[PDB]
Amino acid sequence: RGECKFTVXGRTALNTXAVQKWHFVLXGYKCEILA
Amino acid sequence: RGECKFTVXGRTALNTXAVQKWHFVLXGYKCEILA
């Protein structure tokens, strides 16, 4: 429940409902992971 | 030389004019870089 975002290294992982979203931002390189 | 596609291993990069775009697709891990 609620919106809780965590920071691990240089990527921010947030919990969207019951899915896992991993946002990767490193300069001009943006990686998007959908678990 | 012109506009072709380069597939090395699992990294699909395409040449768009004078900009090199590297795309990464590995299931739920889709990382995209704009160079």
Interchain contact B35–A (C-beta under 8 A) = yes
Question: CB-hemisphere CA count at 13 Å for B27?
Answer: 2
Pairing of strands A19-26, A29-34: antiparallel
What would you report as the CA-atom Rg of chain A, rounded to the nearest whole angstrom?
10
Residue carrying structure tokens 């990069």: B13
Please name the member of A30, A34, A35 whose beta carbon is closest to the beta carbon of B32.
Answer: A30
CA atoms of A35 and B14, how far apart (whole Å): 26
Cα A32 from Cα A21, distance rounded (Å): 8
| Ordered alpha helix ranges (H), chain A | none
User: Which domain covers residue A15, as residue numbers?
Assistant: 5-34
| Cβ atoms of residues B30 and A33 within 8 Å | yes
Task: Indicate yes or no: CB of A33 within 8 angstroms of CB of B32.
Answer: no
How many domains are contained in chain B? 1
B32–A contact, CB cutoff 8 A: yes
Q: Show the tokens assigned to A16.
A: 């969207």
Closest B-chain CA to A20: B28
